[model samples]
Target: AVEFAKSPAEVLRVGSGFSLAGVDPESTPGYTGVKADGKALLAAQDARLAELQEKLFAEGKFGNPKRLLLILQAMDTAGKGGIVSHVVGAMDPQGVQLTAFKAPTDEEKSHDFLWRIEKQVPAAGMVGVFDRSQYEDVLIHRVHGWADAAELERRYAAINDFESRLTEQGTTIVKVMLNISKDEQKKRLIARLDDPSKHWKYSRGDLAERAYWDDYMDAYSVAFEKTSTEIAPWHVVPANKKWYARIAVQQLLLDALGGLQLDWPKADFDVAAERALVVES
Candidate 1:
């Protein structure tokens, strides 16, 4: 594992030649804090995330064109939902749009894979999140042979172009792949099986998928190379340590929203006049 002193986004960000096999899911690369420190780290940012999120939400009334999309892709039990619940849950639901894409329906299979995705892009000034996203088209299709080589090539190109177009239109895309080791997944699966409440989270299909873990990693590695572009990049967060993963994602989100230098939209009406009217009324 490599060590770095930068932010999580910088330390975890994937470049063209980044190899999934090189990352140890159990290690925290950029963060020096321990598990005891994680929630406080997250708590420190909760109010800030809410404030920034609300500023973005308020901007909608002014026709602010900027938006944010966080794309999450991961193997089972890597805790994509945890990131959503812990990090994104800090923001007001009214300003957040979330979609957890599952197996496509027959109607969905009828159209180009991206057709359904385009429909769900966040509207102006909202934070859009995909628990699993368009990359599934390439990762799953490649693993299952649902798409041929030429078809996979085409979908990758289309995905790049599609994301580029969204960026040009003022969307900042944050793509993340939660990295988890097979051993950790087995432990999580066992815990779920042992707990009655978590039984619902288990799926026989998850085991079936884990059988092809090596293949999935290859597919994901290829994706990081082909689709991790300048406009939109992929961050592979080490997720075996769930607390660290959540904290890292929170930092990345702050970087994205904070980079906008957003401020509360200026009041359009005269503040003194409104104050006097309220006082008199």
Candidate 2:
């Protein structure tokens, strides 16, 4: 972990083996300090992300083709909300496409899953976020046997094909799995009961789903195996600590934004002439 920790992008990233066993849910690997330290660091990153987002937006005005998509997936109470509130919230939400995927409605079910996903993909100037994301099809469905094995395999192919098209068309995809432990999830879910404000986030269904923990783990393992591709990979963030998960996600967004080599659009007017006119006036 210390070795991989040198690069936030590399350390948190999950690859072909797709085993969650090697990752310590409570450990903050890539980052240098404890939980307290990360909060300050995340704050520092906010302005940088804002600046980068604006430049990307400007680049789009100049007809630049690239955009960003941040796909966040996790088990119940894994702190997906924190990542959004702390990191992406720092940016101009007007330029970001934020979608919280829920159980598909009858209307959504009538079409392919990607139909809704495709509609929400960010335009050239935007940063799109999926709070739960398309993987629910594989994650929840596999756990409940909603889709058969052959259909499951087909969905994987379809996901790969969908992402491939996104990549080919100038989308930089950042996929994160907030890897929280069952023990941590238990604490969070119980804590929700203690506060009335949090009551809305809690549900009988979340607890029922927790009963199938082992099955969900198996489903996630297969998800990483099938969909973690060179074109678009899955990043498994240690989410037992809320601070670590938030900062790690912030870094991933920064990396994506920086990779675009974005710059403010060049001014078309005569700068000196404009300055002289303003000064004289």
Candidate 3:
């Protein structure tokens, strides 16, 4: 069994040369807080993040072209949707732009894989999020032989170049892959079947794809090795516990935003004059 870390600094982050085979899903990693303290911690993360995001928006409005992009990739039943829902729910809707990429359309295929992605890049100040991103090109393509190995490698290049360009354009990228064990995934699937409300979120395609679980893991390994650049590394989240996963992601975002050194844009107009006008009026 691989021992996951208790501090956010140690867990929920991936770089090149890391392997996922030993991660334990049910165990919470990258958090030092006790269960009783968890809610407060998450609340704090929520409050702090909202302020930073507002600052990012302000900076963009005042001519800072930097932005943030958070990318999520995960297996079925891995709680990516839950993370999106619970953590991001606290952010003001206008502050972030979200795109959930489903299976590509025929027109999408006619163009390059990154065409839709390019259009959704966040405006200078907004947070851009991808529920599943261009990595789907390498991941699903490799899993089912929908594309050949050479094509997969080519995609690796395209994705790398795309990210590099985004970085050059002043975008900060956070890529996360939620890791849940096979048993955990099975339980989630069963729970969905038993709970009628969740049935709509379930898909027949999910079960069929589980058969290729090992192959998918291999594809992930390859993808990570080829494309985990210094600029955009994959953060592996231990997602067996829903609450833990949400907080971990929230923490990651907070850290990324803090690292950017974002500041509130200075008012261009004279504040004294505005105050005088308001007083006179």
Candidate 4:
């Protein structure tokens, strides 16, 4: 008998074969081979997505504060900012909350790693985004050997518990790992270097980390192997062709939020009074 059943958790495992670095960009759908005049097609998709998001967030529809936690992690120039600008930008501002985390401050370092993150969880009826979040503990620290084995294991277990608690509290965690090839990173880094106007975006620190690319990859592999649970699943998005990556992320968000019962808020309508007022006007 074929094992015809898989758990919800199993369904979320993005297969290891799904790597952007290994795939040819030209072969990817919604990405490569866009003609010079493809703006109309892009615009059409954007419009449809906006309409769907509006309906999902309409008053009294899915009104219980559908919170979305977007966790983004990658080497610099992995298109995290671009994804944020395109995907999250389409949603209603009033309904979305964005938190951009960077190197820890003195106050943040003194406390637990999750201290700063807990402060930014979305209130009911809103979406919360993390530019770079607690995952840095696993990704960066592990790659650079900044933390001992005991501390590392503690973080992994703590993160799993933290995510489970959030799910119990009614938050839908959508963690996306944008995997871009080294070639793509090189092109982007070069663009920053060649363009004087983009100098501010270029960071020498990014290059320093480049030497440890394989180490970071192994770190991420272990992270996914251990921490990707049903409560919070990770979507490994292909970031080589940015257009395809954006579409994939958008579709993932749509699928997560589309299942809710969204309907317009109830209102007391005085039909007779309204008719009389219109006549007077």
Candidate 5:
């Protein structure tokens, strides 16, 4: 098995390729390519990830209804769909639920920022995945100054409180922020613009938003600094290389699930009755 480091501090120090306020993209190794060996390692890890997921689910250990929440956030075209489809694909469909939070509806806007999220928390014994979640209130809203200072502070407090509550209630929260380089993002966006099939995914608005890249990076840095906790820790996956990101994410999941050390639930059977019913014709 290809060994990947598990140190959060080291990973964070590596930094996202994107530049933040006063940080220049040219100074950073944005879109730095992965080594061929690293690519092979990640591929092996992906296979192992699928194996473990299937075993865990079939053993009835995961169906215990202990909620597993995967919170994923990223810039546009950061491979969220590919990650979701590959990493969690092997899981029992009935035991897992995925919710994608988009632009809020009228009802959603009328309520508090977390109101829409509360409704989607997975029930006992299931895994719930959030594509983009309440963190947007902190990341995007804070970046654009969409919410007032007081409101932003309230959100910060609310986020901590909400996540704490979930942890207390037996939820295992894994929050991942996929950090992609500006160059990679630019390439993906351009490809979308060029391809007819991908045209629907492109938005002229993204370019307008890209102008504020530095602000968004600072917002993300602050979010991670404040929110990385003992219970619900954050994983900042390097997404310049999609394969590397997938391996890192899978390894994190493996670490989390392995910590639980779940075993197959015991089965009750009537041995004698079963033998009598198996008479040869």
Candidate 6:
């Protein structure tokens, strides 16, 4: 096992022969900090994240096509919502485009699967979040035998091509799978049932899906093998501990944002003239 102590991007990234079954959901690779430290680290990233996002937003206004697309996929109760509320939520919502894909509408269903997804891609300089993304078409479809083998194969290639086109067009894609163990999922499900406030979060379908856990894992494994490309790679983040997952994801966002080397847009107007006018007034 390779030790990744510096970067979560390095630690959690899926490479050749990466298997969902091989990852321990509770493990926090690349980070040794405790909960308080993790929270602090996440907080520490805020200023830089905010600034980068602002630069991105500003650049977008000037026709910079560069943007970030975060594709979050996970089993129920794996804290996909937590990552959103804690990590991505730290950014200015104005610069963020959040989409939680549910069952397709009649209109969506009539079109190609990628049609609805294509509409939601982030514009220049924005951070786009896909809560449950196009992978659903393969994941659920595979586990339930909704799509035949040939169709599944075709979708994988289609997804790869779609992501390639997006990347070539300047969208930085961060595809993450929050890996939650079945045991941990059970505890979370029970906790949801125990707490009145969380009762609403619990879904009957969550339990129903538990029966097909192995099949889902198999499906994810196939998806990773087929769709994880050099350009748009997958990261299977261990997510049993909420703090660890949050910190790791925040760091991933930092890596992507920092890579852009974003800078504030230059003043289109004369700064000296504006300052003199204001001072004189």
lDDT of every model, 2 decimals: 0.87, 0.84, 0.81, 0.68, 0.69, 0.86
lDDT of 1 by residue, 1-281 (tens): 12225887778989866888899999987877688777677777788789988998888768898999999999988899888887667888989999999888999989999998998999999999999989998986434474467888898899999999999988999998999999999999999999999998899988977898888888899889999998898999999999788878878888899998888898888999999999999
Question: TM-scores across all candidates?
Answer: 0.95, 0.93, 0.92, 0.81, 0.81, 0.95
Candidate 1, superposed: residue stretches over 4 Å from native: 1-5, 141-147
Candidate 4: residue 168 lDDT (0-100): 80
What residue pairs clash in candidate 5, if any at all?
A: 65-124, 65-125, 66-125
lDDT value for candidate 4?
0.68
Tens-place lDDT per residue, model 5, 76-177, is 788887888766674657767789888888998899889999999876656678988888888764334854667777777788889999978767787887
- Candidate 3 residue 33 Cα shift, in angstroms, is 2.7
Model 5, 138: alpha-carbon shift in Å?
1.4
- Rank the candidate models, highest TM-score first: 1, 6, 2, 3, 4, 5
Question: Candidate 5: deviation at residue 178, Å?
Answer: 0.8
State the lDDT of candidate 3 residue by residue for 157-244, as single tens digits: 9999999999999999988888888778889899999999988888887787688788888888788878878898877778888777
Ranking of candidates on lDDT, top first: 1, 6, 2, 3, 5, 4
Please give the TM-score that candidate 2 achieves against the real structure.
0.93
Estimate the TM-score for candidate 1.
Answer: 0.95
**Candidate 2, residues 1-281: lDDT per residue as tens digits?**
21124667777777755578788998887777876777777777788899999998888878999899999988878888778766667988788889898878899989987898888898998888989877888886523474467888888899999999999999999999898888998899899999999998788877877898878888888889898998798899998888788888888888888988988998889999999999999
Scored by Cα lDDT, where does model 3 land? 0.81
* Model 2: residues with Cα > 4 Å off, grouped in runs: 1-5, 142-147, 277-281
**Model 4: ten consecutive residues of lowest lDDT:** 1-10
